[PDB]
Amino acid sequence: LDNGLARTPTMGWLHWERFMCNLDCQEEPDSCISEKLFMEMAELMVSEGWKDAGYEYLCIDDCWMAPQRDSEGRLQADPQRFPHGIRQLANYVHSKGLKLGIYADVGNKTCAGFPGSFGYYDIDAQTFADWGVDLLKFDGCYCDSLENLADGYKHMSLALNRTGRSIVYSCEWPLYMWPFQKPNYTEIRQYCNHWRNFADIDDSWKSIKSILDWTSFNQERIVDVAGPGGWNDPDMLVIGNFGLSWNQQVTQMALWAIMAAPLFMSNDLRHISPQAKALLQDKDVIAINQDPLGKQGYQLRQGDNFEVWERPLSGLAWAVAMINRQEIGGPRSYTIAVASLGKGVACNPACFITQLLPVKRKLGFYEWTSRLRSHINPTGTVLLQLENTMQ
Amino acid sequence: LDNGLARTPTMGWLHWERFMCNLDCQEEPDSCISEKLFMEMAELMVSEGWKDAGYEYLCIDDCWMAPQRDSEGRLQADPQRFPHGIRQLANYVHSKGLKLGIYADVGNKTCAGFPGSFGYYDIDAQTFADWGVDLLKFDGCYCDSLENLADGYKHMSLALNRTGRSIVYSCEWPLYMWPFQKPNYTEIRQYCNHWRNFADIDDSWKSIKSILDWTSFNQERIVDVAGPGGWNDPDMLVIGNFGLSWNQQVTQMALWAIMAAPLFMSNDLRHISPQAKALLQDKDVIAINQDPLGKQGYQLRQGDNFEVWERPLSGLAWAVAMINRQEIGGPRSYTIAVASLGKGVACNPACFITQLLPVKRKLGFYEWTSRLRSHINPTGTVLLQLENTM
Ligand SMILES: *[C@@H]1O[C@H](CO)[C@@H](O[C@@H]2O[C@H](CO)[C@@H](O[C@H]3O[C@H](CO)[C@@H](O)[C@H](O)[C@@H]3O)[C@H](O)[C@H]2NC(C)=O)[C@H](O)[C@H]1NC(C)=O
Ligand SMILES: *[C@@H]1O[C@H](CO)[C@@H](O[C@@H]2O[C@H](CO)[C@@H](O)[C@H](O)[C@H]2NC(C)=O)[C@H](O)[C@H]1NC(C)=O
Ligand SMILES: *[C@@H]1O[C@H](CO)[C@@H](O[C@@H]2O[C@H](CO)[C@@H](O)[C@H](O)[C@H]2NC(C)=O)[C@H](O)[C@H]1NC(C)=O
Ligand SMILES: *[C@@H]1O[C@H](CO)[C@@H](O[C@@H]2O[C@H](CO)[C@@H](O)[C@H](O)[C@H]2NC(C)=O)[C@H](O)[C@H]1NC(C)=O
Ligand SMILES: *[C@@H]1O[C@H](CO)[C@@H](O)[C@H](O)[C@H]1NC(C)=O
Ligand SMILES: OC[C@H]1O[C@H](O)[C@H](O)[C@@H](O)[C@H]1O
Ligand SMILES: OC[C@H]1O[C@H](O)[C@H](O)[C@@H](O)[C@H]1O
Numbered sequence: 001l002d003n004g005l006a007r008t009p010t011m012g013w014l015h016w017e018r019f020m021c022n023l024d025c026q027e028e029p030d031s032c033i034s035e036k037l038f039m040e041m042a043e044l045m046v047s048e049g050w051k052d053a054g055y056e057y058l059c060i061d062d063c064w065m066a067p068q069r070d071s072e073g074r075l076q077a078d079p080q081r082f083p084h085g086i087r088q089l090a091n092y093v094h095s096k097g098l099k100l101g102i103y104a105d106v107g108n109k110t111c112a113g114f115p116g117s118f119g120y121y122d123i124d125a126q127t128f129a130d131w132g133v134d135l136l137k138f139d140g141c142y143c144d145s146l147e148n149l150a151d152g153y154k155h156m157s158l159a160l161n162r163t164g165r166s167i168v169y170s171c172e173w174p175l176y177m178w179p180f181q182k183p184n185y186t187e188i189r190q191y192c193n194h195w196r197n198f199a200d201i202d203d204s205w206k207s208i209k210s211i212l213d214w215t216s217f218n219q220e221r222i223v224d225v226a227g228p229g230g231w232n233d234p235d236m237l238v239i240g241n242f243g244l245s246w247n248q249q250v251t252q253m254a255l256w257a258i259m260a261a262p263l264f265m266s267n268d269l270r271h272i273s274p275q276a277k278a279l280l281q282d283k284d285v286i287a288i289n290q291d292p293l294g295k296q297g298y299q300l301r302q303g304d305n306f307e308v309w310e311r312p313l314s315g316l317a318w319a320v321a322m323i324n325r326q327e328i329g330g331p332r333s334y335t336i337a338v339a340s341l342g343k344g345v346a347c348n349p350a351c352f353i354t355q356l357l358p359v360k361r362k363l364g365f366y367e368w369t370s371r372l373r374s375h376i377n378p379t380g381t382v383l384l385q386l387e388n389t390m391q
Numbered sequence: 392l393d394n395g396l397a398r399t400p401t402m403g404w405l406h407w408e409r410f411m412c413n414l415d416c417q418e419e420p421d422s423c424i425s426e427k428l429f430m431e432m433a434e435l436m437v438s439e440g441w442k443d444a445g446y447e448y449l450c451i452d453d454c455w456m457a458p459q460r461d462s463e464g465r466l467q468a469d470p471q472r473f474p475h476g477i478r479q480l481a482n483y484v485h486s487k488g489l490k491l492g493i494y495a496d497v498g499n500k501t502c503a504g505f506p507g508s509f510g511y512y513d514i515d516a517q518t519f520a521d522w523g524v525d526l527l528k529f530d531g532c533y534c535d536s537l538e539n540l541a542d543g544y545k546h547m548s549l550a551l552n553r554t555g556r557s558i559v560y561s562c563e564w565p566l567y568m569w570p571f572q573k574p575n576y577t578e579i580r581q582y583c584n585h586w587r588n589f590a591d592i593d594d595s596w597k598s599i600k601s602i603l604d605w606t607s608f609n610q611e612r613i614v615d616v617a618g619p620g621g622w623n624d625p626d627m628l629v630i631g632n633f634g635l636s637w638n639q640q641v642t643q644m645a646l647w648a649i650m651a652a653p654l655f656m657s658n659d660l661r662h663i664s665p666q667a668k669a670l671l672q673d674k675d676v677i678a679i680n681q682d683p684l685g686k687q688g689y690q691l692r693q694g695d696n697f698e699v700w701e702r703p704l705s706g707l708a709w710a711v712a713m714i715n716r717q718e719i720g721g722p723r724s725y726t727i728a729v730a731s732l733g734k735g736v737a738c739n740p741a742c743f744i745t746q747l748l749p750v751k752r753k754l755g756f757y758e759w760t761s762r763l764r765s766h767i768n769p770t771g772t773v774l775l776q777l778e779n780t781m
Contacts, residue, residue, distance in 0.1 A: 020720050031721050202719035203769050205596065205634070242638045242769040243596070243718055268721060327595045327634050329411045330422060330659065378594050378633040 006193040009262040012057025017266035021063040044269040053281040059101025090132030101135035106152040107143035125159035135168035140176035157191040172196040185225040194231035201235040203243030226296040240267030240276040247380035254381040257289040258297035316388035318342035324376040338370040350391030357383035397584040401653040403448025408657035412454040425472040435660040450492030456505040481523035492526030497543035498534030516550030526559035531567035548582040580621035592626035594634035607690040617687035631658035631667040638771035645774040648679040649688035709733035715767035722766035748774035
């Protein structure tokens with residue numbers, strides 16, 4: 001989308017995977033979807049390093065709206081869970097120097113059953129602009145047909161542009177087109193800063209694998225449409241939560257960096273381990289994700305329960321990720337010709353290789369003709385930065 | 392098995408899940424199956440408090456044997472990877488106050504394809520006892536028929552008795568019987584100190600879930616037969632490895648306690664996190680697994696993506712485990728009437744509940760009319776001990 005936004009993948013926090021549609025503020029106050037949840041996450045994004053590391057957009061997902069429209073036809077916040085409106089929360093979030101994301105649905109209802117935007121695009125985009133919304137997540141539930149799906153996704157893009165306001169536009173359009181038919185990603189890049197391709201993540205190694213294998217399988221159709229302004233969205237970061245091992249958490253961080261994925265943490269910043277945090281705020285791995293060339297990486301080799309992915313970076317540099325997909329035994333030896341990586345270009349006549357993950361380690365100079373030997377933890381990934389060098 | 396052994400579930404360390412069949416000692420000398428790997432783990436079991444915690448048996452799984460038998464018919468350890476022989480390793484493990492296990496197969500070959508004990512049960516048992524082996528894990532690959540399987544598990548059990556040496560007898564009999572017929576557990580118990588029921592464990596939460604699910608599914612068949620001398624074996628503890636979150640590791644520790652399961656770590660003792668060491672060595676939780684009454688716990692309740700398991704314990708105590716099986720969201724609220732726990736008698740008229748897992752915390756007194764409420768992490772478990780007030 002040519003609105004000047006998401007020149008690198010958007011970065012922030014989204015309530016959905018960790019908080020879901022918890023409406024019960026009486027018995028579950030600490031996890032209900034409430035204005036005070038958002039206000040507290042906003043304070044920690046600032047005091048805990050998050051906004052410094054580039055996490056900028058604090059985003060509301062589904063279940064913030066009142067059961068129906070006001071007597072002017074406009075959406076509203078829940079009166080009990082968000083008594084101060086969206087506009088006061090936006091000021092609050094903006095005062096911390098952060099940006100505010102909201103949620104709506106292209107059809108007659110949102111996914112959880114709240115007011116949809118069909119027949120309301122212009123009114124809502126405007127409403128979002130008058131509130132100070134800075135990103136919109138646009139879901140696709142309860143939609144008549146593909147014709148309406150495309151019409152409505154295209155309409156809202158124009159409506160938001162037509163507001164005057166810089167509002168990052170995040171679509172689940174390819175997801176819901178999937179499939180009556182294969183998405184046309186050029187049409188979508190024209191309308192969307194980023195797009196959900198595949199099924200909702202949850203807090204599992206299963207879910208992670210399935211997204212990698214989905215993308216891996218479908219990379220010839222999706223990797224080249226991504227670049228500054230429009231990204232493929234493999235869904236939220238779930239580091240900090242419960243279902244992933246440390247090694248599976250490095251797999252998720254390493255590969256969302258390779259995929260040039262937006263980075264929306266969905267977790268509880270009040271209760272996150274020091275190692276989850278160091279990982280999420282890893283400056284060298286974020287720099288990869290945020291690399292300004294903005295070409296998405298891809299899967300280079302698959303076999304023998306190993307994968308090799310690599311991303312091209314600015315300045316003739318490359319990120320390389322090796323995955324061990326064998327979930328028995330221990331760290332497995334993997335060796336490859338340095339000439340095989342980065343299209344023979346990294347490492348001609350040499351590259352300096354530094355391991356970023358699972359730990360940060362300067363590894364030596366490697367000549368074009370050199371071999372890299374590594375060892376990879378079951379379900380873990382090894383993440384490497386190759387710097388091209390005169391040598 | 393009325394051999395005086397396994398009066399509480401066996402505790403030790405077993406190489407297979409983490410080290411598998413690595414025969415490559417030139418390129419990976421520190422992780423191949425060699426006498427060295429065993430020596431390292433044996434001194435760490437002593438120096439890092441494993442043995443104080445009750446981990447006693449250091450056990451060799453498959454891939455130790457030389458490719459053929461000696462001129463007199465006896466199994467032999469592999470001459471390059473085990474140059475000193477199994478007896479000397481046994482001498483050595485004994486010196487540290489530990490006991491040594493070894494591994495063989497009922498059939499013609501071991502699962503990796505090394506010499507089986509079929510036709511050699513009497514000589515193999517005697518060879519083992521001659522070496523100072525304190526435990527045999529006996530696997531069921533490469534076996535003709537259900538007859539031979541039963542004949543060989545029975546025969547070996549009797550060869551061992553007759554050495555006059557105490558040797559824990561670990562059996563994979565039931566596992567190899569499914570899907571041909573339902574095993575006779577009353578019979579198995581008579582010949583075995585413990586028995587594997589289900590597929591080999593992985594470094595994965597999928598694997599653990601599927602062991603839990605299999606056990607809770609067949610619990611009517613297996614729970615009551617367990618007790619001092621004879622245990623269901625849900626396979627190795629994998630805590631300390633690569634594939635389980637903290638919360639999944641607690642689940643495995645808690646559930647293996649409720650199930651009165653042998654506790655065989657399969658992990659790298661040389662490289663294990665502090666958190667994973669405190670779990671595996673959690674005194675209060677090992678005390679549950681090791682309860683001298685030896686009645687296996689079971690699943691009480693399953694619903695709305697929660698499970699409740701409970702185990703009866705010495706002295707009118709119970710253990711209760713609450714698992715959250717929903718893989719999305721945050722900690723989720725579970726409530727149950729304490730009248731429903733412990734057959735209605737833990738907590739009549741009252742009980743003191745103390746949470747043990749994920750963190751130790753005294754919770755207070757609960758009248759018979761009370762409800763226990765907890766928040767349970769996705770893939771986590773809360774483990775409680777309940778003391779009846781009397
Ligand atoms: C070969 O088989 C024998 C029986 O199948 C087994 O004998 C059993 O040995 C244990 C030794 O601990 C005895 O137990 C202890 O048991 C007495 C009486 O039951 C208790 O009061 C005490 O706790 C005591 O410590 C069993 O009683 C005994 N059972 C029988 C039927 O004799 C042998 O040990 C086996 N031999 C070998 C070397 O495996
Ligand atoms: C409304 O849409 C227009 C059309 O794309 C956007 O204008 C583009 O903005 C970037 C900003 O740097 C320029 O590089 C392009 O040249 C612009 N396109 C055109 C047609 O010149 C405009 O920014 C949008 N406004 C909002 C509020 O999103
Ligand atoms: C939202 O609601 C209305 C009402 O059901 C839908 O509009 C109808 O759509 C049918 C099917 O194409 C049309 O032929 C009718 O003229 C409409 N009927 C009514 C009662 O108005 C609309 O399709 C729904 N929108 C979405 C996005 O699914
Ligand atoms: C997918 O959609 C895009 C844009 O909607 C198509 O590209 C446009 O096609 C028109 C008509 O042929 C051209 O005149 C324009 O130059 C194109 N616009 C853009 C933004 O590139 C694209 O060809 C479609 N692919 C398929 C298979 O339909
Ligand atoms: C081992 O193989 C032989 C010869 O083929 C056969 O006699 C016997 O049944 C086998 N043993 C078992 C238990 O399968
Ligand atoms: O209801 C909210 C929920 O709905 C859709 O399914 C999206 O794909 C999810 O990421 C989340 O927004
Ligand atoms: O090859 C050895 C391997 O054999 C079988 O698969 C057992 O069930 C495993 O625990 C292990 O001993």
